[PDB]
Amino acid sequence: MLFGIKLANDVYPPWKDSYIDYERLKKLLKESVIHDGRSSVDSWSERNESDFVEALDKELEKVYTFQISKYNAVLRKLDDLEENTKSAEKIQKINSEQFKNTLEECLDEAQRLDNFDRLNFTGFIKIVKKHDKLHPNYPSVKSLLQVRLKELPFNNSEEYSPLLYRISYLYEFLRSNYDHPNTVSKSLASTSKLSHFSFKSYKFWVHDDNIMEVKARILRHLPALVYASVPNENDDFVDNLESDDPTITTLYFDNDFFDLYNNRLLKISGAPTLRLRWIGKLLDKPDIFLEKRTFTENTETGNSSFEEIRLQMKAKFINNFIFKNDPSYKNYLINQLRERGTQKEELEKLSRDFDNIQNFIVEEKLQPVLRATYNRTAFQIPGDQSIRVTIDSNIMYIREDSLDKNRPIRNPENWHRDDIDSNIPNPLRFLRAGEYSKFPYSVMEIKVINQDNSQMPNYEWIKDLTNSHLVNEVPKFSLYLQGVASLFGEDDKYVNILPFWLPDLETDIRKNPQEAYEEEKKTLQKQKSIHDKLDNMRRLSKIVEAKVWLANERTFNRWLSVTTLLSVLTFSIYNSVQKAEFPQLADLLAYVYFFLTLFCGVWAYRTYLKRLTLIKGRSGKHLDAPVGPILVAVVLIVTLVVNFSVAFKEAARRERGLPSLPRTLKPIQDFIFNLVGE
Amino acid sequence: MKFGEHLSKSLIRQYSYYYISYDDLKTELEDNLSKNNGQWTQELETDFLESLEIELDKVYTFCKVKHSEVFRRVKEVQEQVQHTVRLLDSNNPPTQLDFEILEEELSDIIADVHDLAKFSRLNYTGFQKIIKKHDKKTGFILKPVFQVRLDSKPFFKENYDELVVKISQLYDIARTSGRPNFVRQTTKYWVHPDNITELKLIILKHLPVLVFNTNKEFEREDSAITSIYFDNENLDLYYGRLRKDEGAEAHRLRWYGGMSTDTIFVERKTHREDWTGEKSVKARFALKERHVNDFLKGKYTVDQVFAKMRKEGKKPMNEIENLEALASEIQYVMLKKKLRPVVRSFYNRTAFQLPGDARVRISLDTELTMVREDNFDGVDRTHKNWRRTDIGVDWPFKQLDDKDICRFPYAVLEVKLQTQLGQEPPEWVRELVGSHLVEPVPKFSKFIHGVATLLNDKVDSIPFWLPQMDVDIRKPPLDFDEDDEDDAALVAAMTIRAPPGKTICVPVRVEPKVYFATERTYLSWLSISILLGGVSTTLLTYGSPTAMIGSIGFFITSLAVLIRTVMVYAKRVVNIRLKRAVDYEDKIGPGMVSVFLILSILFSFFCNLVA
Amino acid sequence: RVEPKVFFANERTFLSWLNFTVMLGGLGVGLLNFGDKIGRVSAGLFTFVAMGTMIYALVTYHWRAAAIRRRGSGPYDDRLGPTLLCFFLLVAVIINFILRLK
Amino acid sequence: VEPKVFFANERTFLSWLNFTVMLGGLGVGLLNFGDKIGRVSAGLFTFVAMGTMIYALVTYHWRAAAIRRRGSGPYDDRLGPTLLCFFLLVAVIINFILRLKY
Amino acid sequence: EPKVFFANERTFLSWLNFTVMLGGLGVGLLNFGDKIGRVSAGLFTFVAMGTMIYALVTYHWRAAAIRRRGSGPYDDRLGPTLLCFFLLVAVIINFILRLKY
Ligand SMILES: CCCCCCCC/C=C\CCCCCCCC(=O)O[C@@H](COC(=O)CCCCCCCCCCCCCCC)COP(=O)([O-])OCC[N+](C)(C)C
Ligand SMILES: [Mn+2]
In DSSP notation, B94-106 reads --SSHHHHHHHHH
Beta bridge partners, A288, equal A313
Nearest protein Cα to ligand 1, atom 17: E32
Residue A16 and residue A130 share a domain: yes
- Are B147 and A513 contacting, i.e. CB atoms less than 8 angstroms apart? yes
Phi, psi of B191 (to 5 degrees): -125, 130
Looking at the structure, do residues A534 and A655 belong to the same domain, yes or no?
no
Rounded distance between C-alpha atoms, residue A260 and residue A266, angstroms: 10
| Candidate of C34, C42, C46 to mutate for ligand 1, largest count of ligand atoms within 8 Å of Cβ | C34
> Which ligand is nearest the CA of B414, by number?
2
Our CA angle for B310, B313, B317, nearest 5°, is: 70
Q: What is the end-to-end Cα distance of chain D in Å, rounded?
A: 60
Angstrom distance (rounded) from CA A146 to CA A504: 9
**Range of the structural domain that residue B284 is part of:** 185-468
8-state DSSP, B466: S
* B268, β-bridge pairs: B251, B283
How is B60-76 classified by DSSP, letter by letter? HHHHHHHHHHHHHHHHH
Distance in angstroms (rounded) separating the CA atoms of residues C26 and A565? 11
| A42 within some domain | yes
Helices within A87-160 (DSSP H only): 96-133, 142-150
B188 CA from centroid of ligand 2 (Å): 8
- Does the beta carbon of C5 lie under 8 angstroms from any beta carbon of chain B? yes
E26 CB within 6 A, ligand 1 = yes
- Pairwise CA distance, residues B536 & B548, whole Å: 9
B414 C-alpha vs ligand 2 centroid, how far in Å?
Answer: 7
CB B451 within 8 A of CB B234: no
Give the experimental resolution in Å.
Answer: 3.1
The helix (H) or strand (E) run that includes residue B343 is strand B340-354
CA distance B346 to B400: 14
What is the pairing mode between strands A225-227 and A436-438?
Answer: unpaired
Amino acid letter for position A482: Q
CA distances from B113 to B120, B161, B166, B420 (A): 11, 9, 12, 17
Q: Please tell me the number of the ligand nearest to residue E86's CA.
A: 1
3-class SS shares of chain A: helix, strand, coil, % to 5: 50, 15, 35
- Contact criterion met (CB < 8 Å) for E7 and C11: no
**Ligand 2 centroid vs D101 CA: distance in angstroms?**
86
Judge whether A624 and B573 are in contact, CB under 8 Å. yes
Rounded CA gap, A21 and A7, in Å? 10
Close Cβ partners of A571 (under 8 Å, ≥ 6 residues apart): A590, C27, C31, C42, C46, C93, C96
- The closest residue, in CA terms, to atom 40 on ligand 1 is D22
Cα distance between residue D96 and residue D100, in whole Å: 6
Of A282, A279, A268, A347, the residue nearest A318 (C-alpha): A282
**CA A237, A239, A242, A244 torsion-angle sign:** negative
- Gap between the terminal Cα atoms of chain C: 60
Q: Would you call D43 an interface residue with chain E, using a CB distance cutoff of 8 Å?
A: no
Assign 3-state DSSP to chain D and report helix, strand, coil percentages, each to 5. 80, 0, 20
With H, G, I as helix, E, B as strand and everything else as coil, classify residue A116: helix
Helix residue ranges, H only, A400-478: 460-466
Distances (CA, A) of B383 to B226, B287, B342: 19, 21, 13
Q: Which helix (H) or strand (E) holds A362?
A: helix A344-364
CB contact under 8 A, E98 and C16: no
Amino acid, single-letter form, for residue B103:
E
Amino acid identity, position A41: V
Q: Report d(CA B276, CA E36) in Å as an integer.
A: 60
3-class state of residue E70 by DSSP:
coil
Q: Count CB neighbours of B403 within 10 A.
A: 9
Cis peptide before B396 (omega within 30 of 0): yes
Instruction: Give the closest-approach CA distance of D53 to chain B in angstroms.
Output: 7
- Compute, in angstroms, the gap from residue B446 CA to the centroid of ligand 2: 9
Q: What is the DSSP string of B387-408?
A: S-TT--S-SS-TTS-GGGEEE-
Residue type, position E75, single letter: D
Question: Obtained via which technique?
Answer: cryo-EM
- Residue A243 — left, alpha, or beta (φ > 0 → left; ψ -120 to 50 → alpha)? left
Residue A444 near residue A203, CB atoms below 8 Å = yes
Considering only the beta carbons, identify the residue of B493, B495, B547 that sits closest to D32: B547
Do residues B588 and D12 lie in contact, with contact meaning Cβ atoms separated by under 8 Å?
no
Query: Residue A195 phi/psi, 5° resolution?
Result: -70, 130
Query: CB–CB of D92 and E27 under 8 A?
Result: yes
Q: Which domain-ending residue is among A497, A522, A543?
A: A543
At a CB cut-off of 8 Å and minimum separation 6, what does B109 contact?
B70, B73, B74, B77, B167
DSSP secondary structure string for all residues of B121-158? HHHHHHHHHHHHHHHHHSSS--HHHHHHHHHHS-SS--
**Residue A449 bridge partners (DSSP):** A199
Q: Is B358 helix (H, G, I), strand (E, B) or coil?
A: strand
Are A577 and A537 within one domain? Answer: no
Cβ A240 vs Cβ A496: under 8 Å: no
Nearest ligand by distance to the CA of C53: 1
List of residues 6+ apart from A281 with CB closer than 8 A: A421
CATH of the domain at B448: 3.20.100.30
Instruction: List the one residue out of B267, B256, B280 whose CA is nearest residue B230.
Output: B267
Task: Give B594 to chain E, closest Cα distance, Å.
Answer: 19
Ligand number nearest to the C-alpha of C31:
1
Residues on chain C touching B489 (C-beta within 8 angstroms): none
Query: Phi/psi of residue B352, each to 5°?
Result: -125, 120
Burial of A223 (0-12, 13-18, 19+ CB in 10 A): buried
Nearest neighbour of B493 by CB, restricted to D5, D17, D27:
D5
How close is the nearest chain C Cα to the Cα of B421, in Å? 21
Instruction: Count up the domains in chain A and report the number.
Output: 3
Helix boundaries (H) for B313-454: 317-337, 427-433, 446-454
Q: For chain B, say whether D40 makes contact (Cβ under 8 Å).
A: no
Which of D58, D23, D22, D16 lies closest to D44 in space, CA to CA?
Answer: D23
| Ligand 1 neighbourhood includes A575 CB (under 6 angstroms) | yes
Write out chain C residues lying below 8 Å of A598, CB-based. Answer: 90, 93-94
Q: What is the DSSP letter of A432?
A: P
D22 pocket-lining for ligand 1 (C-beta < 6 Å): yes
Tell me which chain D residue has its CA closest to the CA of residue B540.
D32
Of C8, C12, C73, which is closest to B479 when you measure between CB atoms? C73
C85 and chain A in contact, CB less than 8 A? yes
What are the residues facing B231 on neighbouring strands? Answer: B340
Distance from C-alpha of A661 to C-alpha of A669, rounded to nearest angstrom: 9
Buried b (16+ CB within 10 A) or exposed e, E32-48: bbeeebbebbbbbbbbb
Counting atoms of ligand 1 from 1, which one is nearest the CA of A575? Answer: 25
The secondary structure of A363-408 as a DSSP string is HHT-EEEEEEEEEEEEE--TT-TTEEEEEEEEEEEEE-----SSS-
Q: B268: closest CA among B227, B225, B224, B321?
A: B227
What is the least distance, in Å, from the CA of E10 to any CA of chain C? 8
- In terms of DSSP H, where are the helices of B179-251? 196-204, 236-242
Q: Hey, are the CB atoms on B483 and C73 less than 8 Å from each other?
A: no
What kind and span of H or E run contains B186?
strand B182-191
In chain A, residues with a C-beta closer than 8 Å to the C-beta of C14 are none
CA distance B229 to B267: 10
The 3-state DSSP class for residue A349 equals helix
To probe the interface with B, which of E4, E6, E21, E66 has the most B CB atoms within 10 Å?
E6
- Residue C46 carries which side chain, given as an amino acid letter? F
What's the gap in Å between the CA of C29 and the closest CA on chain A? 11
Reported as half-sphere exposure (CB side, CA atoms, 13 A), residue B423 has a value of 15
Phi, psi of D5 (to 5 degrees): -65, -50
Backbone angles phi, psi at B563, to 5 degrees: -65, -35
A325 touches A360 (CB < 8 A): no
- Which numbered atom of ligand 1 lies nearest the CA of C35? 44
Asked if D72 reaches chain B (Cβ–Cβ under 8 Å), the answer is yes
Domain boundary among A169, A196, A223: A196
A647 & A579 share domain: yes
C-contacting chains (≥3 CB pairs under 8 Å): A, B, E
Q: CA angle, B103 as apex, B101 and B106 as ends, to 5°?
A: 110
Phi, psi of B71 (to 5 degrees): -65, -40
d(CA B546, CA B604) in angstroms, rounded, equals: 10
A576: enclosing H helix or E strand:
none
Phi-psi region of A30 (alpha: psi -120 to 50; beta: other; left: phi over 0): left
Helices (H), A578-626: 583-615
Neighbours of B407 (CB within 10 A): 12
State the closest ligand 1 atom to the C-alpha of A565, by its place in the atom list counted from 1.
Answer: 36
Does residue A580 have its Cβ closer than 6 Å to ligand 1? no
Name which of B260, B265, B253, B210 is nearest A234 in CA terms: B265
Say whether residue D39 is in contact with chain E using an 8 A CB cutoff: no
Query: DSSP characters for B283-314?
Result: EEEEEEGGGHHHHHHT-S-HHHHTHHHHHH--
CA distances from B528 to A562, B298, B539, E15 (A): 10, 64, 17, 19
Residue by residue, DSSP assigns C11-70 as: HHHHHHHHHHHHHHHHHHHHHHHSS-HHHHHHHHHHHHHHHHHHHHHHHHHHHHHHHHHT
Residue type, C35: G
| Closest Cβ–Cβ partner in C4, C23, C58 for E80 | C58
Answer for the pair A252, A273: CB distance below 8 angstroms, yes or no: yes
Chain-centroid distance of CA E38 in Å reads 19
The neighbouring-strand residues paired with B440 are B189
- Name, in order, each residue with C-beta under 8 angstroms of A253's C-beta and a sequence gap of 6 or more: A260, A273, A274, A275, A276, A361, A366, A367, A368, A369
Domain membership of residue A631 as a residue range? 546-676
Whole-Å CA distances, A579 to A573, A582, B254, C35, E12: 10, 9, 84, 11, 40
Is C12 touching A (CB cutoff 8 A)? no
The dihedrals phi and psi of B152, each to the nearest 5 degrees, come to -70, -20
Q: Are residues A63 and A129 in the same domain?
A: yes
β-partners of residue B369 are B346, B407
The answer to whether the beta carbons of residues B353 and B207 sit under 8 Å apart is yes
The total of other beta-carbon atoms located within 10 Å of residue B278's CB is 14
Residue A230 to residue A226: CA distance in whole angstroms: 13
Residue from the list B204, B259, B416 with its beta carbon closest to the beta carbon of A342: B259
Q: How far is CA E2 from CA D3, E15, E64, in A?
A: 20, 20, 12
B351 Cβ partners below 8 Å, 6+ apart?
A228, B209, B210, B361, B362, B363
> Which residue precedes each gap in chain D (C to N above 2.5 Å)?
none
Cα A603 to averaged position of ligand 1 atoms, centre (Å)? 30
Question: Which residues are paired to B229 by β-bridges?
Answer: B252, B343
- B349 annotated ligand binder: yes
Q: Is A524 helix (H, G, I), strand (E, B) or coil?
A: helix
Annotated catalytic sites of B, by residue? Answer: 446
Nearest to A538 by CA among A651, A621, A603, A455: A455
- Residue B269, annotated as binding a ligand: yes
- Measured CA to CA in angstroms, residue C20 lies from A471, A567, B533, C57, E18 at distances of 88, 12, 20, 10, 10
